[PDB]
């Protein structure tokens, strides 16, 4: 079931985990499946894609980086046999190919890219690692960057401040370490997170999204955009103002280039 | 011509009669923020964050930080440069001098025909 953590230091965010026996061992707090065969003393640290990538492949238009970055260190020689590793990009037959997937390893050599064997609908398998900084995700399309097509999960907060609810809506791809870093970055004006997911359809990279309130308040910063970046920067936030304690809120994420929208929720003020 | 992710921020500090803002347009390497903040902790503000720069700026970046109305404005072109952990930040220190509710600004390139960031700030919660 659920396995413990030991935080050695919160700054570079390194965890030591005791793994008892063989097992599948899914850990969905960040999304790691550890097919192991013995006692494993494993350490997982925090990596950012800006400092380790070679600075050409962020702005490269056939090198869309996915996933978060992990410095995993474990016991070799079939002790940790497979690493099911969290990507986010979608698994459809058209415009996405399995051979476009690559897994990188950030050695002191540099970046070692190999094809994986199988892709799972949130994960990809890493077969028999030989060790640090290896939890990675890259992709080589032969087609442009604008159509890798994975949809964010939104997260929105209603907060009471000078008796006026400020909302907080962010739309980023599913990276739980990026989610918790945006949470602790927003914790200066602290969040409270209800459980809603806007995973209705597929929306691509460099998509300009309009925020529409169906019943209207003061609408602010309406042309938002879909970007991905490392686990430090300011997001594409939305902070509308409610100014009252009315119960229901109807929000819509709608495209501009094509007439079809992507997302609609109706959210209550049950626990403000 | 690297296209680096910008750092826009609108710090405000409501002083006793003349509220002084602090517009930070800066590149980031994850050490200068805390050092510049503890430099400015003599006048300790809060951070009212705003619309981040979705579009991305380049090298030799001379931009115009144009408010839609008139404000206290010397040094009105802003510049984006890198610096080590000993120099002051290339940033604007305006004083908006009264208690008006809203202020609206934009960031405009020189040879282009397009803006890059359209920011809004409300003075409804002064620290």
């Amino acid at each position: 079931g659920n396995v413990d953590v030991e935080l050695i230091d919160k700054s570079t965010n390194r965890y030591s985990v005791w793994f008892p026996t063989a097992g599948w061992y899914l850990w969905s707090a960040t999304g790691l499946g550890f097919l192991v065969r013995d006692e494993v003393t494993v350490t997982i640290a925090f990596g950012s894609w800006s400092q380790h990538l070679a600075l050409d492949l962020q702005h490269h238009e056939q090198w869309l980086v996915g996933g978060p970055l992990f410095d995993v260190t474990a016991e070799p020689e079939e002790a940790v046999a497979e690493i099911h590793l969290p990507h986010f990009i979608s698994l459809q037959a058209g415009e996405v190919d399995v051979s476009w997937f690559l897994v990188a390893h950030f050695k002191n050599e540099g970046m070692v890219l190999e094809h994986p064997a199988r892709v799972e609908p949130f994960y990809a398998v890493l077969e028999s690692p030989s060790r640090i900084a290896s939890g990675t995700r890259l992709s080589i399309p032969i087609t442009s960057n604008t159509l890798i097509y994975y949809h964010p999960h939104p997260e929105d907060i209603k907060f009471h401040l000078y008796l006026v609810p400020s909302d907080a809506l962010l739309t980023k791809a599913i990276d739980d370490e990026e989610d918790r870093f945006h949470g602790v970055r927003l914790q200066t004006s602290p969040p409270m997170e209800p459980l809603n997911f806007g995973s209705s359809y597929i929306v691509s990279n460099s998509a300009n999204l309009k925020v529409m309130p169906k019943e209207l308040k003061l609408s602010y910063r309406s042309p938002g955009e879909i970007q991905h970046f490392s686990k430090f920067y300011a997001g594409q936030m939305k902070e509308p103002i409610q100014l009252e304690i009315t119960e229901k809120r109807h929000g819509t994420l709608v495209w501009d280039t094509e007439v079809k929208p992507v997302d609609l929720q109706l959210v209550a003020a049950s626990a403000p | 011509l690297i296209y680096y992710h910008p750092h826009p921020e609108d710090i405000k500090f409501h002083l006793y009669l003349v509220p002084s803002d602090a517009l930070l347009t800066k590149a980031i390497d994850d050490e200068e923020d805390r050092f510049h903040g503890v430099r400015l902790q003599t006048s300790p503000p809060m951070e009212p964050l705003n619309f981040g720069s979705s579009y991305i700026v380049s090298n030799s970046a001379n931009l115009k930080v144009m408010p839609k109305e008139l404000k206290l404005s010397y040094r009105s072109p802003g510049e984006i440069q890198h610096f080590s952990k000993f120099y002051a930040g290339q940033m604007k220190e305006p004083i908006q001098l009264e208690i008006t509710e809203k202020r609206h600004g934009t960031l405009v390139w020189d040879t282009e025909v397009k803006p890059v960031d359209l920011q809004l700030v409300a003075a409804s919660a002064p620290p």
């Binding site: 050409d56 002191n108 540099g110 890219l113 | 011509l1 380049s58 090298n59």
Partner: protein
Amino acid sequence: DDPAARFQVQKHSWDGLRSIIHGSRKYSGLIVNKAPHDFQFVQKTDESGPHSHRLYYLGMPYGSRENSLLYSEIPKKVRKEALLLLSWKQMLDHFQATPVFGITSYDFHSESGLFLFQASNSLFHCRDGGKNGFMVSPMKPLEIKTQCSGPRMDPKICPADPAFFSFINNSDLWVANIETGEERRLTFCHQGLSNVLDDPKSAGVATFVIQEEFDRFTGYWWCPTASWEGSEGLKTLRILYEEVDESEVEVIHVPSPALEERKTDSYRYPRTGSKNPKIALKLAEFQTDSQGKIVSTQEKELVQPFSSLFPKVEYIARAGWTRDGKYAWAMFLDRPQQWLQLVLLPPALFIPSTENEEQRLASARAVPRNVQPYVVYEEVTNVWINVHDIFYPFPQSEGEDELCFLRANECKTGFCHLYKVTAVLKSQGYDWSEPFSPGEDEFKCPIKEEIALTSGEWEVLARHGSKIWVNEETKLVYFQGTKDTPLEHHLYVVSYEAAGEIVRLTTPGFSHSCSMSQNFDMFVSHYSSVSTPPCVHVYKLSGPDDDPLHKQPRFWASMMEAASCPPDYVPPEIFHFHTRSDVRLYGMIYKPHALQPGKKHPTVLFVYGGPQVQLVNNSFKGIKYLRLNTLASLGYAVVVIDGRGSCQRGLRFEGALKNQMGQVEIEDQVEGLQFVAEKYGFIDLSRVAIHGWSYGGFLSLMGLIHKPQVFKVAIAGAPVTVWMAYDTGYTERYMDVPENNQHGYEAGSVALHVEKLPNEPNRLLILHGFLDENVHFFHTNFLVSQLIRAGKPYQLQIYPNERHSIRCPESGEHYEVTLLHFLQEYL
């Protein structure tokens, strides 16, 4: 006439066209990253660490504006079904090397592991990989202080003694030492009292015409070994340098970059007919104690004057030394540039230099009778000598005569091919005190043998900083060539003992710029195709050591992935065709985007056409000819042709422009147009634009003069309007001498044929950079002058801050929006 099948380009506003050019150049800063170059492999020799080598190179890692020295770590083992991409580690810790920018070039000495380079108005050095270990984290580079004032141009470390180095300061050769900080001038010929109009003596510098038409950027060469005079313990250290006097050569004033001051710079510019600068070879020696301090010094000069010992020798193309140090070699060349000959100058041939003519006689007596210069090789041709800097001599430790060398020879068969040549150094015996006139071929050695290592209808890349790599223990020579196809540059290897099969080491379907290890176990190739953008891959020669020729190059690691094309980039199509003389010419075409069958689109014939430039090849054009794709994306067919006169097709091909340049290449461009018109179906012959830069603009004007019925407009950029004003090295090489070839000078000087330009307006746009040092603004001025005098219209555009290539992006953006506007309205 019939507008049903004619594509009309959508007329955009000027701000629209700027918006289009910016949308083109969003990824232009990404598609070129100053891809790494000047590679230097050094082994680790540790047997327990993980890295087999360290690759040193220049690069900008895209995180900074500056070009800097970097390195990668080449491992001992990488696995298949993988792809290793190297991190670019720093040796220089995040400073600025500019007041392209950064460190332009650097010098390296292998044994000490010394990296001496030039950066922002000062000299710098660092060290890595000698008896000192291979570091990991970068340190500060040590700056070399000087008491002398001015910039220190072209520094080189002495190979014989790495503690000492040398540089040019104020057009005089200086020498210094890294650890003690001491320096000393060696040539005292340039006093620097006033302008170059009154101080014309230079030393160790490459002049204008040598620098820009013979591609030599230095005029001094260290001796690689240290002789011992043996007074008590003194270590001699020689340098060959070329003294050059520029007194009797014409001075031209060209505007300085600082336009506000309204000052010019004088330039010793030898135009055709006028006298080239007066050259000579010279020895600057000095000696050293064991502690590493200079003691004595000495200028030396040949026993005869240089002009008399080597009559009708006009240019020193190249020079250097044999690896043992026993001779200083030099490639000489005649003023028509058809009579190249290599000569070896043994250091005892140079007596000291004094004004005392009796001391001069004294050491003229002192020089032995046996020593002389041996002319080993003499390339003579009826077209022109293309100067190939491929020599490499072999050591001759047994039998101290019988020189064995390698030599590129294009004049022999018509194509640049390597040869192994063994000449015999038989001394005739000369009393060097008596002055005399040498005969025509009295220093010419007879040749023992001249085996040809390669042969065929293809040529070996020799110029433009390409080179050969000679592994002497496996007895192989690695060269680059066009053996598979003229459109591609491939790395080949062959044996120089047994000239058998020539083995290609690079993958086909691409064009490759390669660089070997000094230990010949792995190379780099920076390669690209027309479709694939440039990548830089590290390959590894691997196999049984008993057969080193067939060592299979297996891909080891990758430096950069192909920094890709824009989404508005479709690759152009290469084609070929035959002329009426049945000569195969190659060409490219960019098709109009969203092409519909039936419509005849307007066609921009882009052109250079002149020698030493191959426009069509299987290399990536998007990094440099993005504008051609922008034209295509607006709907223009863009055609690019290499007619007769282009390079990389042999001497007989290049020589079709001989003494009539401007007349046959444009005919080939017209024929290429007519070929593309019948083969494809989207060429509107009524709407044809011709366009190009300096030779291309000269041809664009020849197109509008001698073929006005086909070319509707002509965008001539920086044109050569009078060949009488262009300098010696280029113009005389192809167009013999002015006073000999007056018929072809007048026939091919476009500014004298303005009467044949169209009387209709809006057909000719002249572009010119005001500060151009190569094809001076006088050329455009004299053209517009003769247009005024003939009463013919023109449009004109100036770039006041741009010299030859439009370097700064606002000026390039204006150039492109002007090109799009001109085509929209008047094509």
